[PDB]
Design a protein around this nucleic acid. Structure first.
Ligand SMILES: [Cl-]
Ligand SMILES: [Cl-]
Ligand SMILES: [Cl-]
Ligand SMILES: [Cl-]
Ligand SMILES: [Mn+2]
Ligand SMILES: [Mn+2]
Ligand SMILES: [Mn+2]
Ligand SMILES: [Mn+2]
Ligand SMILES: [Mn+2]
Ligand SMILES: [Mn+2]
Ligand SMILES: [Mn+2]
Ligand SMILES: [Mn+2]
Ligand SMILES: [Mn+2]
Ligand SMILES: [Mn+2]
Lengths: 104, 96, 91, 77, 99, 85, 108, 92
DNA sequence: ATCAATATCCACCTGCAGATTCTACCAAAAGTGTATTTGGAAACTGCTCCATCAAAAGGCATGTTCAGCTGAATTCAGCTGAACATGCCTTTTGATGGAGCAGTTTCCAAATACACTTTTGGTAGAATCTGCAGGTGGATATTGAT
DNA sequence: ATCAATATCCACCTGCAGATTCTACCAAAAGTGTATTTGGAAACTGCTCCATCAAAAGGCATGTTCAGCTGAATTCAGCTGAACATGCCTTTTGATGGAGCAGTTTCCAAATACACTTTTGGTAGAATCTGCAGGTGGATATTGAT
């Protein structure tokens, strides 16, 4: 049985372990580090896909596209902060018109 | 004949383009520019097409971001019209 | 050849939205996302280990790295998930 | 060739940026800005290209070059 | 026979020249130290500080504020004012990406 | 053991803030700037100190060091010179 | 046994090549390190140091001082376009700022 | 208790460029900060470079490229010239 | 704030091209069974520095008064920049070769790792050396009311 | 078209706190030899890209008209700067304990190393089924005449 299934995870613990061992991060890598990291990565992925899935069906699409990811991310203050210097290709921007520019 | 008042169509265009994600610059001139500039750094360069598209996604996101800030500067000065000085304040505070 | 997080992102997608799919471009954004956060956390954990003259990155460096890099609620939530996973794994 | 970035293109960029009204002097100003940015990024991209002893700028070369601009681009890995 | 009195702005300009020429910290040290300890105390009780850690915090904080005030000043001037206001600070921080 | 610390953000006084603005080139100051400045400072300080202590705890230390602060400041995109060793 | 010669004198440098090499080895930057890497790096570090000290020494003497203080380093860095770029997000403790009053603020 | 620092080397360079000029301890501290900062910038960029190209070795080539990526303009050309010179002399 | 008239936005529809999901083969990577080494934590303990308080002197924060000049509000028109029609040309889209890069594989000479032993440059602390902080006084640009 | 009142500039001085030089031990760099890894030269091979040619569509350049935004001009109330008195609390310098970094030493729990099998994820075609190109009608705005 895989380490990922032992950890309750979908993300690959073994691959993460190898990527840490060979990324020139440290001389040694502890048994719990890739489990912990894979879990963090999985958690953030689920957070974004949950929100993007919601936008996708609020636009009546069965497939998540970059727009939906952009909408999900910029409408969430914490995701938007975590990804504040990231450009999502083909994501566009949030609909936002400054109130002073509206008529009347 | 019918004629929209100045600003009405502008607003419509803002809603339209803020809802969409398509690239707003024409591909061939952008590509031409990239190759031209690239000439000054290294001779006989080739480009992957996706590299050109990466450059264009980045350039357009940069410009759209800059215009958002620029607009905030124009509005700060009680205008609705963006001006070069708005761009310049924006870039200065960005540290550009 | 070339590896990616695609099948794992698709597995997560299926857990949270069983009937929802994802375009190729969106999957490319998700892969970029995972590699980015991996490098932030791994890099912060590495510099932390070095700052403390340790040669080993353990889950404690990962946890501390997460606290340094993630905002607020995302941090608490990620830490709880990581801790759970290590505890289940070690069982 | 910089004049290939036309006035209506720039104007579309402004609209996506939420701008309602635009000074006539914006277009040249924008072109100058765009040029600087492109130069910087392309310069670093080619540095990566040269380092790898390649003649072909790749998407990843560009992605890495964009980090010097403190910009992270998703979608081209 | 009236006492001598500078016009508003003259002394302000003198103070700008004065503090832009100098490098001393502008916030009183002991009050700053109390601030740092109060805040840190709310994250973990009974912390101690290296003396230089407090001074590092005060250097970073004053550099940060003076930088923010430079940007703030540009925003006020942009709006044809000479007086900085909260909306100037807020625009600066928004464009800086702090907000 | 020392007198409980309270309300110390008010130690960042009107004349201190005035001096900071002067070094920043400011000639004239709205009355509302002072409270705004305190708020902005408090947020910056909280964030930096928060991260510093995270380094301190990670090291199982009780004493915040200058380097803890130096590393903390990186999260703010600031590199602080003069406090190593 | 041949008489010792430092890699630093061999490369014509003042900065410590052996130390730079050790620091490269223990920072886990790569699994292997080329013979020329620490030399090249020591040389770049040395050179940038010379540049900042040259300009800072100049400020020091434009102020009638024989000793460089943080102020001179700040003046050096901020008045030089490229150093100012390189060190754009750096705070020099006790550096102060450049004398700069916006023209609109001056009297009539 | 033994602490290494770049102080003696910065002082040697100082005496080269300004033979009659000294330096305060605080200023020496800013210089030690500077050297360590740039060290980590260059070394890190070179590490990521080697990794991007699947090479296990950081050579002077990675150092040079990292230097070009990190430094602006004239500064970059000048640094590369100093480094290339030090390497050729060293290997001679 | 009405109606009447007009233009545009936005679901909702179908048909079908093509973009995604499914499938199956197979190097490569993960797992596994054993063996072996080692980083760092625990338990010490020496001994820096840190917390806190003390006293005294004066630098500076605070609170007040008063008025100069700033920001805010207002008015108005010149001329900028929006909107729209027209018709040309640049881009887009599609087809086709073929030169030339990437990407590989083998395999040795050359580079680098790393232990051992030896030497010396770098450090800490002591001893010397000296810039410049303050201190004093006079010259001198500057300011504001006449 | 001045002066009086002030602030700022500029030598000049000396003592001592902080910087530099001296001293000598020893940690770490260097020399040497052996083991292991790697770079690149040569010889491949598809396959991306560049060049070129072509038609046509829709996006742009241009010219016209005028709505309404910007910037200038003007006015005034009250905010904020300047200055003064008062007295507090910061600064400075030093004491006194002792918390808690660091420096050592021991020794397992956890990590690496290695040989080999098992499992998996990447890839490219097949099979599925979503979106999208246009089209329509209703919802929703906008504009002008009153
Ligand atoms: Cl672990
Ligand atoms: Cl302008
Ligand atoms: Cl305000
Ligand atoms: Cl090398
Ligand atoms: Mn508290
Ligand atoms: Mn073995
Ligand atoms: Mn050990
Ligand atoms: Mn005014
Ligand atoms: Mn008119
Ligand atoms: Mn010696
Ligand atoms: Mn003096
Ligand atoms: Mn020894
Ligand atoms: Mn499978
Ligand atoms: Mn349609």
């Amino acid at each position: 049985k895989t380490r990922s299934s032992r950890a309750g995870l979908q993300f690959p613990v073994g691959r993460v372990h190898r990527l840490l061992r060979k990324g020139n991060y440290s001389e040694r890598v502890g048994a719990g580090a890739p489990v912990y990291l894979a879990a963090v990565l999985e958690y953030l992925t689920a957070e974004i896909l949950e929100l993007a899935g919601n936008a996708a069906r609020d636009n009546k699409k069965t497939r998540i596209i970059p727009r939906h990811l952009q909408l999900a991310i910029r409408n969430d203050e914490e995701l938007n902060k975590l990804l504040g210097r990231v450009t999502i290709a083909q994501g566009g921007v949030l609909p936002n018109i400054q109130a002073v520019l509206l008529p009347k | 004949p019918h004629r929209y008042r100045p600003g009405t169509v502008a607003l419509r265009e803002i809603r339209r383009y803020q809802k969409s994600t398509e690239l707003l610059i024409r591909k061939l001139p952008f590509q031409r520019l990239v190759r031209e500039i690239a000439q000054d750094f290294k001779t006989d360069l080739r480009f992957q097409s996706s590299a050109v598209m990466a450059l264009q996604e980045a350039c357009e996101a940069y410009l759209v971001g800059l215009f958002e800030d620029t607009n905030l500067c124009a509005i700060h000065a009680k205008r609705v019209t963006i001006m070069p000085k708005d761009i310049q304040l924006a870039r200065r505070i960005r540290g550009e | 050849r070339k590896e990616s997080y695609s099948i794992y992102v698709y597995k997560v997608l299926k857990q949270v939205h069983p009937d929802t799919g994802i375009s190729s471009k969106a999957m490319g954004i998700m892969n970029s996302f995972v590699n980015d956060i991996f490098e932030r956390i791994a890099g912060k954990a590495s510099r932390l280990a070095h700052y403390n003259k340790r040669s080993t990155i353990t889950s404690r460096e990962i946890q501390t790295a997460v606290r340094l890099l993630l905002p607020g609620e995302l941090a608490k939530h990620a830490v709880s998930e990581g801790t759970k996973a290590v505890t289940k794994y070690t069982s | 060739n910089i004049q290939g970035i036309t006035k209506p293109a720039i104007r579309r960029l402004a609209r996506r940026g939420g701008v309602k009204r635009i000074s006539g002097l914006i277009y040249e100003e924008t072109r100058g800005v765009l040029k600087v940015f492109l130069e910087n990024v392309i310069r670093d991209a080619v540095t990566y290209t040269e380092h790898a002893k390649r003649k072909t700028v790749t998407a990843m070369d560009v992605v890495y070059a964009l980090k010097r601009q403190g910009r992270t681009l998703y979608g081209f890995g």
